[PDB]
Amino acid sequence: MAKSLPLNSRSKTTALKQPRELFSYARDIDGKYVYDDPENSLSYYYLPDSTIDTGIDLQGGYSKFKKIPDEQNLADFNSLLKAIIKYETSEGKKISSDIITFREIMTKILSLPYNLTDPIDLYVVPFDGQLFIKSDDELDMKRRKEQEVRMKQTNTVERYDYMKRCEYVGYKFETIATIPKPWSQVSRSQIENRNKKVVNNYEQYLSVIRTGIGNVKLVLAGEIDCCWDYLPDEQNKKLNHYVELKTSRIIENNSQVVSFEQKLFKAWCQCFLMGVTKIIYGFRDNNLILKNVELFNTEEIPILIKNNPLTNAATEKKINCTNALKWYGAVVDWLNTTVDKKDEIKSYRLKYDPVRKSFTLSETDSETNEKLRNGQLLTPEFTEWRQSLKK
């Protein structure tokens, strides 16, 4: 049985906390995490207009694509806690936050209002005065699986192959737009030979930030694509220099104008939540050749969506970013006023049910609440480490 939040809930408040990076960690070419010197894993954006003019083929190398199987690539709470231990150890203290979770989780919530057909299924878990929130993985995988089989069964073999190559365009773009070190420390041939480099999606640089909304405090782990220019030593300045990289088809008609608006909004959700101030889009034609690249400043995106004449639509259907924010804040304040964070015996389920227009918080089963507390979310080491701070 459930508590539910009217989908028309909107905070009035939106006092906004300035995001700040706490630490980072990484994943390597084989899937393994890395807690020491993760900065060695941070690439740097490098893609001069002159080179774009060469007409880079974003499907070069498709065949050799080194791709992590989906099950291995679910947002991993184990490594993150493991990462979190290291940093709290050093601080001599635990992170002040009302919530701790991956940021894709919050992106979905923040973007829900204009993505009303997309389910959301997550677990919520009280522990040490804080809420821990991971995604119902089982469910997720089973959808990706069944969505996969639809796409295969309802399309021609060529249309399916093309969709698969589009998925690769994203990684390939990241590969030919970044360099592993800054410009000063990299050779001219390391630069000119990126287009041959074998593409993988194993390697990741992950940042854990502290942020907040109204009077609630959040910690978000999320992936960062690269650094814009350089990475300052100064802690509270690092987020200002990351870039998100995306790619999109060139825009031909009005139908694509709105499709692009909706992508751009999603991306603004992700980056706003993370404090990433820069979004680059590489626009590629139907032969998956890169045509031009355009940088957006995150904080300007709301203004561009509001003022597009082509996409003036119905108030309830028009993307407004503030209105989503007011929704977001109304969500987290609900999570923050509904669960006794201190009561660490039961867990919950966040469900958004698209068919039933329901946003439900409901207590989980008892085995449920167990396995989350014993290895599925919380780990022996983290649980242990966290208690020993009062002892």
Residue numbers in the entry: 1 to 391
From the paper:
Rai1 homologs share several highly conserved sequence motifs, and our structural studies show that they are located in the active site region, mediating the binding of the divalent metal ions and/or the RNA. We have found substantial variations in the activity profiles of the Rai1 homologs, and discovered that some of them possess a new 5′ triphosphonucleotide hydrolase (TPH) activity. The overall structures of CaRai1, AgRai1 and SsRai1 are similar to those of SpRai1 (16), KlDxo1 (18), and MmDXO. Each structure contains two mixed β-sheets that are surrounded by α-helices.
There are essentially no conformational changes in CaRai1 upon RNA binding, with rms distance of 0.38 Å for the Cα atoms of the two structures. The structures of the AgRai1 and CaRai1 free enzymes will not be described further here. CaRai1 had very low activity in our biochemical assays except for decapping toward unmethylated RNA. The CaRai1 and SsRai1 structures are especially similar, consistent with the 58% sequence identity between them. The αC helix is absent in AgRai1 but contains more than four turns in CaRai1 and SsRai1, which also have a longer αD helix.
